[PDB]
Amino acid sequence: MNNKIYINIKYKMNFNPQVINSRNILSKNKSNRIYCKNFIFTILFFDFFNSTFSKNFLPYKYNLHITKKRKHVGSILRAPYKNKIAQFSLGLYRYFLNLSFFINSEFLPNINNKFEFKLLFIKFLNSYNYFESTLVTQVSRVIKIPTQIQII
Amino acid sequence: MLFKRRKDILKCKYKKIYIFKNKIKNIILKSIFFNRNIKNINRAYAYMILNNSKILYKKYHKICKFSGYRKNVNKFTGIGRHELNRKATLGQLQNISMNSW
Amino acid sequence: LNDKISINFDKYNLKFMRKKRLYVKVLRRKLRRMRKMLRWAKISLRNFIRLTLIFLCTKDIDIFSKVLVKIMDSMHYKNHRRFLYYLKLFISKSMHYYFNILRFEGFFFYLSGKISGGGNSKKKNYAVKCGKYSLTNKMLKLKYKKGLIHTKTGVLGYKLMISYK
Amino acid sequence: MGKSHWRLKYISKSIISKIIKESIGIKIKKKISVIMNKSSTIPSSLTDNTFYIHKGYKFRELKIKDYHVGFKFGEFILTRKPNIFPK
Amino acid sequence: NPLPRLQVDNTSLWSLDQNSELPEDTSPEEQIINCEGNITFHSGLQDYEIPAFPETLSSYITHYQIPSIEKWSIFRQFPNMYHWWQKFYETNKKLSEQPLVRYQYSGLPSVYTYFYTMPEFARNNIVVQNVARCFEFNRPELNHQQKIMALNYAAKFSLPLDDLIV
Amino acid sequence: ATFPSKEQMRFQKNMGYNGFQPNIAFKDDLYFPLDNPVQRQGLEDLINHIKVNPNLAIEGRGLCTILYIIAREGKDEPFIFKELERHLYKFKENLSPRLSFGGLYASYKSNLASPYQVSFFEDEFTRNSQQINAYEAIEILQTMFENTTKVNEHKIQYFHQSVKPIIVSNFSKQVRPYTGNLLKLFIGLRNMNIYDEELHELILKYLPYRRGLNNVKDIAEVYETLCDYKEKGILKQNIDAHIEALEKKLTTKDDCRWRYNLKEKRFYTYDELIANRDNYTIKDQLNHKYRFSNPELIEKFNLVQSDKD
Amino acid sequence: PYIKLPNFKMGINPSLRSKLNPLALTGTQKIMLASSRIFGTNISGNLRSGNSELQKKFSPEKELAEFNTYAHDLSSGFPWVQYYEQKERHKMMIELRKMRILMRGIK
Amino acid sequence: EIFYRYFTHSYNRNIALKPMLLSTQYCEYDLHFYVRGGGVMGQSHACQIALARGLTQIHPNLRPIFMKFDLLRTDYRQKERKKTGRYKARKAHTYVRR
Amino acid sequence: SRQATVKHLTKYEAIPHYMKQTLRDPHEYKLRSMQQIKDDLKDTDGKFVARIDIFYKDYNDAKFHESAMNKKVKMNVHLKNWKLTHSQKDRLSLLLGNRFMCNDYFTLICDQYTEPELNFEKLVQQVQELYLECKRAP
Amino acid sequence: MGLKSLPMLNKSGISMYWHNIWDSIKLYKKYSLSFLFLNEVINHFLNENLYYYCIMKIRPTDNINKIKKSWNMRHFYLGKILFLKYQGW
RNA sequence: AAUCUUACCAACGUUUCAGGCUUUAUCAGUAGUAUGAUUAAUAUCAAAAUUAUAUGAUUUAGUACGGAAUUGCAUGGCUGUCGUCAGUUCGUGCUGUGAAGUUUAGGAUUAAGUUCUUUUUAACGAAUGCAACCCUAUAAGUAAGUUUUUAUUUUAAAAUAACU
RNA sequence: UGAAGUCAAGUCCCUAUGGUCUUUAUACGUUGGGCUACACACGUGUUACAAGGGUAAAUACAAAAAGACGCAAAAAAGUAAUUUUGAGCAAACCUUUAAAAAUUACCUUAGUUCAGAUUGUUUUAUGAAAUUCUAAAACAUGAAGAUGAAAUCGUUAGUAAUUG
Ligand SMILES: [Mg+2]
Ligand SMILES: [Mg+2]
Ligand SMILES: [Mg+2]
Ligand SMILES: [Mg+2]
Ligand SMILES: [Mg+2]
Ligand SMILES: [Mg+2]
Ligand SMILES: [Mg+2]
Ligand SMILES: [Mg+2]
Ligand SMILES: [Mg+2]
Ligand SMILES: [Mg+2]
Ligand SMILES: [Mg+2]
Ligand SMILES: [Mg+2]
Ligand SMILES: [Mg+2]
Ligand SMILES: [Mg+2]
Ligand SMILES: [Mg+2]
Ligand SMILES: [Mg+2]
Ligand SMILES: [Mg+2]
Ligand SMILES: [Mg+2]
Ligand SMILES: [Mg+2]
Ligand SMILES: [Mg+2]
């Protein structure tokens, strides 16, 4: 009765994220930038609600990860005609998060109906968009719950 | 009558709607025609009907909604060449930046 | 959109005094020759002064642009040249002082075509400059408009530019 | 060279209409002898028949014979008048 | 100081008048303009939930105020989660507490229900067999109708031919 | 040749992109698309907005529209109607026809309205009996059978006063071109046990011969009933010719044979059809050309190739 | 010309669909067939069948979703627009030509 | 994989063991290094830097030797870009004056 | 990164017909009946229950025409309730085909419909149809 | 004329929010084109009074120069239109 | 540039708005389509089957007709090149009758109107550009780590191999 | 990343626009054709004239980028192009990607096991459609060319060149 749950969340955020050691110290030649600050509300969720999390139903092992990826839009000609050299390039930069945390459980849910597949997955994941900010929006999301079905 | 853009957008529109609805028809006919295991006749009678249709709504070619110019298009944005040089001045394009590798 | 909405017809947090004082009158004395040009548009004097200060503060290219277009259209195509010489002095001398207060820095405005002329007559280019308009400063900020004016002689394109901190 | 054999040869809407009108016995005439869509292959039933083929702003004439079968209409007709550098 | 404000979420309807009688003189867009403060429409909320948009904004420049919206959004997340997490505890708590019975199987839309009504000579062709597979499994795009309507167009090619066509 | 051609212009119509629905709000005093699940949550919020707010102000529109929808969706709400009937004095002899239709339509179908609530709308429906549409009046007949608050007698006297002049005057245009306006009417009467000869005359001229009767369940139930009136002899006018036409449809059309019996008088099951799976009764079914259009040419095609022999 | 030469190899070119003898099936063959009913797989020879064109995905409507935006032409997507000023300039300039056209017709 | 069975030719092989002569600790140790990226010659010269940096943690006496042989310095030198109107980095179209 | 595919010469060509390997079809036997199966689960009185693990995804992008992106429903199934013999295991590794499978669990995916419910029940109809056809062996 | 290459895009991603802040994946074409359809609907809905239009013709029946000039909106001065996305909102 | 594209040539055909709104008149067993016939093709005609889905299909008048037709020596807008050369220019003050110059002339330095200098009874300051801030590759230091990254190590089960 | 502005440089034929012209035609839709013609000649660029090469067989290491009107592993067939088949993935998770070189062996300076055009005929792929007017593979055809006059161009280190 310590069945495991798996939740993997991805985000998108165009601007650079900032290191938390770098708030009191940062070079004035870089101070006028933009950053996607406050990308850590995900971590904060498991400290405010630490008192509400029961012992039957408890999160643990929450971790983040960073990546970067460029998409290519193409080199577009800059003139109306007869200038092949004139090409201004265009591209797109992104930064993805990858949250991943487990929550244990004493329960194990039973299934007896199709509608139960909707009561537990489809209503929650569609209502998971709250876990979001303006710049930090989410592409995908995952939930894994062990279950029981009485086939035959 | 209509100016060139608002006309030509409709031509390239009606060509797709035809395809959208004769989709299932033209996928089954073409399925039989390439089914080598069948006799040749039924493979041909489908080829006979497959041509007995409006080809005019099949000669599709891309177009830009804004300029009316057809040859160069950015599929990532769905708009043209003469326009992106303009919007890039205004910065209207979202999340784009100049590649400095 | 299949999604929830909230629309916010908000206003600016800025307001103006109720009492005339010196610092209004100092502007009215300088902006007098424009009053003739201003009456053609049925535009008031009080309102024109405000929108610029809203513009220097709020940094919205769209607002101060429409003020021009209502003037530059109601006028006749002889008189555009003078209106700008009064606009150059107005920005360059009077309002150049407000810049450092509002963390504001830079103005630039470039016309294109037949600002005043008829039939077969040359192009002319007019400019306005004050403060900083740099482009290789990737850490400097900007906002950019590319505009259009119609006449009986032809067409005129204008480029507003602006910069702030 | 040509297509693979299993890719059956092309005969458009039109010639399929004409082959049927042959089958009924309806003779070929001013407009029925007319041909377009040259890529359509030259069928076998229509031996002993004239067909006025189209190019540009006028036409060409031919009769069908068993040797002409299998080919395409547009391989017998010339579109571009040949080029000769003058003296 | 922050101006006054209004909020309008579907209670709009109750105040609404007929269309046979409306103010032809005064327009809403004018009322929005001449009336002080600010005005807000939004699609609605629950009792436990906060307005999405911050009702007030410190600055007026775009660049300098948008962080006030990030702070607001994060400031909004919490009551929605206690409503979410609390349910996610409760639903699971029902199901392990429910009793098990056999899985109450239910109906799927499939094309085989039409296939097994057709006679042999259609069912035995390589065509219609290969139809009912790929239109059943590898094509979710289509309705239950558009697939059944596809066989009957394929079954026509099971039939023989006249001598004209041949 | 013209551009655009008519066959093209239908493409944009069949997909539905020719409309602009916000214009409908100015045409209909009630307008609630519910084209999305978010929009539906906007409905439930109203229902909780009322239960929580005992003190509440309204207009005549927002009241009547909510009832129209709850009736249309069929949600049960014994608490909503008593809360809203209080205000009905506010809009006596004032409401539009379209709105007077709604709360009327909902009071019947709800099976929850008061005899005072129904009394308020019946005075208004009559007050606008001319401008009201025919298809609207027909849906009222669909609700009399679904309501049980009233006795069927009062529903009939109300049907003779206000509803007959609508339909009979607006028969040739609003109803006659349409089959759906007729079918729901013909079903709506027998379920109400009302039989007037001013209508069944006007109705039966057209129904049994239409192509619009595409669903066999629409064909059959007309055949199910018209065979019964003969047994009872209720209607005086002869009907024998009408019924024979429906039999020929039920026989000739190969679908009806595959789903229905005249003699056994029922539909087939799914299992029973598998028994008749391989029984191929059809005669001379095959790929063809000109057959049902011009079979003369097929005969010529036999002569020519025979002459070559 | 058509140079043909003899192929000293024999027999049908083998295939899963051809190794099968439905009258005499092995255990490994009934098992695969029992998978095909489940997931809808296909068994066919080395030669082409039409399943590759029944399994394909062909989404033409996604282009219409661009044509249905009507961002490029507001009047086609939002007919309540009425460009008042642009019509005024269009009318003034026309009428002034007609002054010129008639006055030049005399002159 | 095995040493002779991955780095086939010996000039790829002496590079990686050039430090091991400079240490004189031959056969004392057992080596296991995992590499991914680049081509064979560039994939070998990295093995100089890694052992030379690995040994000096053990034998810091060997440092001024590895300084002289430049086995501890990286090679930031990396391939250049293809400009637009150039066939590649530093290669332009033919100039035409007539 | 990915290393490149290479066709190694595993088997030599010309090896005598007598020295080759050939393996019979172990699945050739008399298949079980139904009551033989039900007699195995007498501890549970005609009732079997399976432990499984349901993955599922959602997207903010699944809308007007990409609304089909939310149709997959990935599942795993645990086997230790399945008292699988040596012959029952190999039969099960064939039905799945060239698909993932371990001693502990195996995958099951369906993307046959638009709505995930219909793709979820189909997994149950597969799990049943695979357990029976698997336990039809001894 | 010397080539003043694209200044704003050289500055945007590192020093300036774009005219809107949202982002999307697999739906870049819709939102980028659909908000442009809404920037100008609202402009042309406000800067030109259309509530007076929707009354006269769209509605059945059973000042004019004053509107074509938009005299009622002569004091109106818009600054921007902005768009956002998060939390399904 | 296979068709479309494509503007050009030849020929058949069309004669004024796509959607929305207003309006005139007729039809409603009529209307429509993965239908059928017809033409080279758009077009045009129509009841064997099928669809019937609220408030129709067709028609008159009106709601900015149209134009790759011309003048880039009437213009915008976009762009090439002189040139990645290092210059262009303003406010005030000084000098000269004045044009104008100084500043932007000396010394050195710089790839650079680059920077430094106490060259001077006169220039001080300011904008733009070059530069630099930003991105790629590097070492050193900190911060985070994935069922997806890589390696060292370890727990438990199955197969294979070994045999404790 | 690129100032001021010059070359009345270029474009009204991407879109906008002033003047001018046309409006039963300088406008519009469709079918077919044409832009792919061939005396002489120019600019650009790929492949070769060989042995630091060609070929057969066995068989290593990459980056960057893209993916559902898609990528498509594993097994199997074919001589080969490629096809059957579609596990798995909307993603650092699954997938699409190397050659030159190095090793072993033959060819032994020959207009040649170099070169590889051109042409005939089947097969392979897309499409409604390949003749005018597509690309690729095989059997077979197997021309010129034997490092190029006067003249002239690119390059400054991870550059030239070579490899994909
Ligand atoms: Mg094409
Ligand atoms: Mg395949
Ligand atoms: Mg062409
Ligand atoms: Mg053409
Ligand atoms: Mg023309
Ligand atoms: Mg010129
Ligand atoms: Mg000087
Ligand atoms: Mg690089
Ligand atoms: Mg890096
Ligand atoms: Mg010229
Ligand atoms: Mg050309
Ligand atoms: Mg070579
Ligand atoms: Mg090999
Ligand atoms: Mg692989
Ligand atoms: Mg393979
Ligand atoms: Mg699959
Ligand atoms: Mg080699
Ligand atoms: Mg030779
Ligand atoms: Mg050779
Ligand atoms: Mg030689």
DSSP string, D2-47: ---SSSPPP--HHHHHHHHHHHHTPPP-TTTTEE--TTSB--STT-
With a 7 Å cutoff on the CB, does C108 touch strand K?
Answer: no
Distance E145 CA to ligand 2 centre (A): 29
Tokens read off for A89: 């390039």
Nearest nt by C1' to B7 Cα: K18
Resolution of the experimental structure, in angstroms:
3.7
Contact A109/A126 with Cβ under 8 angstroms?
Answer: no
**Strands of chain I, DSSP E:** 50-57, 75-78, 105-108
With a 7 Å cutoff on the CB, does G97 touch strand L?
Answer: yes
Contact C70/C41 with Cβ under 8 angstroms?
Answer: yes
Question: Which position has the token pair 């040797």?
Answer: D67
With a 7 Å cutoff on the CB, does F232 touch strand K?
Answer: no
Question: Which position has the token pair 């008829």?
Answer: C118
Listed residue (I91, I129, I92, I94) closest to I110, CA to CA = I129
Q: Give the Cα separation of G69 and G78 in Å (integer).
A: 10
Listed residue (F181, F243, F187) closest to F218, CA to CA = F187
Mention every residue, 6+ apart, whose C-beta is less than 8 A from residue D59. D34, D52, D53
Burial of I84 (0-12, 13-18, 19+ CB in 10 A): middle
Distance H25 CA to L101 C1' (A): 33
The dihedral built from the CA positions of residue A97, A98, A102 and A108, taken in this order, carries a sign that is positive
Last residue before each break in chain J (C–N > 2.5 Å) = 62
Burial of B94 (0-12, 13-18, 19+ CB in 10 A): buried
For chain B, give the number of residues.
Answer: 101
Task: Report the half-sphere exposure of F81 (CA within 13 A, side-chain side).
Answer: 23
Listed residue (J42, J62, J67) closest to J52, CA to CA = J67
C-alpha dist (Å) from residue E53 to B57, E39, E40 = 48, 12, 9
- Chain E residue set in contact with G, beta carbons under 8 Å: 126, 130-131, 133-139, 141
Edge-to-edge strand ranges of the sheet holding C104-110: C127-130, C104-110, C159-164, C143-146
Q: Give the Cα separation of F101 and F121 in Å (integer).
A: 8
In the chain, the amino acid numbered J51 is Y
Ligand nearest I98 Cα, by number?
16
Listed residue (G82, C95, A63) closest to J41, CA to CA = G82
Listed residue (F76, F64, F9) closest to F31, CA to CA = F64
Backbone Cα Rg of chain D: 15
**Are the beta carbons of E29 and J16 separated by less than 8 Å?**
no
Whether E49 has its CB under 8 Å from any CB of chain F: the answer is no
Listed residue (F157, F61, F143, F156) closest to F108, CA to CA = F143
Contact F223/F254 with Cβ under 8 angstroms?
Answer: no
Q: Give the Cα separation of J13 and A93 in Å (integer).
A: 9
In the chain, the amino acid numbered I29 is Y
Tell me which residue in I57, I61, I121 faces A142 most closely, judged by beta carbons: I57
**Are the beta carbons of B51 and D12 separated by less than 8 Å?**
yes
Give the end-to-end CA distance of chain E in Å, rounded to a whole number: 88
Ramachandran quadrant class, H59 (left: phi over 0; alpha: psi -120 to 50; beta: rest): beta
Give the end-to-end CA distance of chain H in Å, rounded to a whole number: 62
Instruction: State how far Cα F26 lies from the chain centre.
Output: 25
Contact F87/F80 with Cβ under 8 angstroms?
Answer: no
- DSSP-derived 3-state class of residue H54: helix
Q: Give the Cα separation of C66 and F22 in Å (integer).
A: 30
Contact A144/A6 with Cβ under 8 angstroms?
Answer: yes
Which residues in chain J have their CB less than 8 angstroms from residue G81's CB? 41, 44, 48
**Are the beta carbons of E22 and J55 separated by less than 8 Å?**
yes
Beta pairing, strands C155-156 & C6-9: unpaired
Residues 19-38 of J with CB under 8 A from C: 34
**Are the beta carbons of C152 and G93 separated by less than 8 Å?**
yes
Cα dihedral C69/C74/C76/C82 (nearest 10): -60
C-alpha dist (Å) from residue B9 to B68, B74, G60, J40 = 8, 17, 16, 21
With a 7 Å cutoff on the CB, does F21 touch strand K?
Answer: no
Neighbours of chain F (3+ CB pairs under 8 A): B, C, D, E, G, J
Q: Other C-beta atoms within 10 Å of F168: how many?
A: 15
Beta bridge partners of F269: none
Would you tell me the crossing angle of helices F97-110 and F134-144 to the nearest 10 degrees?
20
The dihedral built from the CA positions of residue H78, H81, H82 and H83, taken in this order, carries a sign that is negative
**Strands of I35-136, DSSP E:** 50-57, 75-78, 105-108
The whole-angstrom distance between B24's CA and the closest CA on chain D is 21
With a 7 Å cutoff on the CB, does C135 touch strand K?
Answer: yes
In the chain, the amino acid numbered A93 is Y
**Are the beta carbons of D24 and F289 separated by less than 8 Å?**
no
Tokens read off for F29: 């005093």
The whole-angstrom distance between E97's CA and the closest CA on chain I is 16
Contact A143/I75 with Cβ under 8 angstroms?
Answer: no
Distance I135 CA to ligand 12 centre (A): 63
Instruction: State how far Cα I27 lies from the chain centre.
Output: 17
Listed residue (E68, E72, J27) closest to A132, CA to CA = E72
Is the peptide bond between F4 and the residue preceding it cis, with omega within 30 degrees of 0?
yes
Q: State residue C116 phi and psi, 5-degree precision.
A: -160, 120
- DSSP-derived 3-state class of residue H56: helix
Listed residue (E25, E23, E57) closest to E40, CA to CA = E57
Q: What method was applied to determine this entry?
A: cryo-EM
**Are the beta carbons of J88 and C4 separated by less than 8 Å?**
yes
Task: Report the half-sphere exposure of A19 (CA within 13 A, side-chain side).
Answer: 5
Q: Give the Cα separation of E85 and I6 in Å (integer).
A: 52
Backbone Cα Rg of chain A: 22
Contact F71/F110 with Cβ under 8 angstroms?
Answer: yes
| CB burial string F1-22: b at 16+ within 10 A, e below | eeeeeeebeebbeeeebeeeee
Q: Other C-beta atoms within 10 Å of D74: how many?
A: 16
